[PDB]
Design a protein around this ligand. Structure first.
Ligand SMILES: C[C@H]1CC[C@@H](NCc2ccc3c(c2)Cc2c(-c4ccc(C(=O)O)cc4)n[nH]c2-3)CC1
Length: 270
């Protein structure tokens, strides 16, 4: 079928690093996101993307290299970033945050299960499809932490300071999985309070010391109900060996609290 390999670049979706363009197929009008990288780091990113196949992870369709430029064909998530669903200083309704948190855990369980750590979990990187299904995106900082059933400890400093686990700032080496668990807890905090608790998790940071001293009568914690706050108390634990694991997050009371009705379906009366 002629022209089916042709895609029109119609809208800029993101910048930094190059750019992410919305691509529309000339024939079928299928929409995909094309990541344009001018163009070792991209080689690893493509290699990790080729491993991925889960409903809460951005789909990787393939890649093409046009000399110095790499084109990554990825899922278009029309709902945009989770970030834009967070109202500043407010957050979002607690049932919406719980549903997004369940979908985030499903994606993180999948990635950890195949031995991949994302390392930069934040609302700017959590995309939403047409049905507001969350998808983990951007595997540019991702790495393999388990291979041939052997865990490799990490030592590379990366991520985004307000979302990073304190062990990345205090220890030479650390386990990969509790780092992603921590960043998910900060995403949950942002979703429920519309604000980030600290600039970074260090003792020099007053808001971080207040949290460790259980001053939950202060913001952002005062805006969060006792059931989700009890989960945050288990996630945002400084010692990564004492921090709750995802299998235990799945047993948490709030995590299992019925709160959100399914999507509004067409109905009539009489
Ligand atoms: C609202 C302004 C900001 C960007 C656009 N809307 C938000 C939006 C809407 C849909 C998006 C993205 C962003 C980013 C993106 C991606 C995407 C996929 C994969 C990666 C990656 O692997 O890095 C990055 C981004 N897929 N769909 C979308 C238009 C103007």
């Amino acid at each position: 079928a002629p022209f089916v390999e042709d895609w029109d670049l119609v809208q800029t979706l993101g910048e930094g690093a190059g750019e992410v363009q919305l691509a529309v197929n000339r024939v079928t009008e299928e929409a995909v996101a094309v990541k344009i990288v001018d163009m070792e780091n991209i080689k690893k990113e493509i290699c990790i993307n080729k491993m991925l196949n889960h409903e809460n992870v951005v789909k990787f369709y393939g890649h093409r290299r046009e000399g110095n430029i790499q084109y990554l064909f990825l899922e278009y998530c029309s709902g945009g970033e989770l970030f834009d669903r967070i109202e500043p200083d407010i957050g979002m309704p607690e049932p919406d945050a719980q549903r997004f948190f369940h979908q985030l855990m499903a994606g993180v369980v999948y990635l950890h299960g195949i031995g991949i750590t994302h390392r930069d979990i934040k609302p700017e990187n959590l995309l939403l499809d047409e049905r507001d299904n969350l998808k983990i995106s951007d595997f540019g900082l991702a790495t393999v932490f388990r291979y041939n059933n052997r865990e490799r400890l990490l030592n590379k400093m990366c991520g985004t300071l307000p979302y990073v686990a304190p062990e990345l700032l205090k220890r030479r080496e650390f386990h990969a999985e509790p780092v992603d668990v921590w960043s998910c807890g900060i995403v949950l905090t942002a979703m429920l309070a519309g604000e980030l608790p600290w600039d970074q998790p260090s003792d020099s940071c007053q808001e971080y010391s207040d949290w460790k001293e259980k001053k939950t009568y202060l913001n952002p914690w005062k805006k969060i109900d006792s059931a989700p706050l009890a989960l945050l108390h288990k996630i945002l634990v400084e010692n990564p060996s004492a921090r709750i694991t995802i299998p235990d997050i799945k047993k948490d009371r709030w995590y299992n609290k019925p709160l959100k009705k399914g999507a509004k379906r067409p109905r009539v009366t009489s």
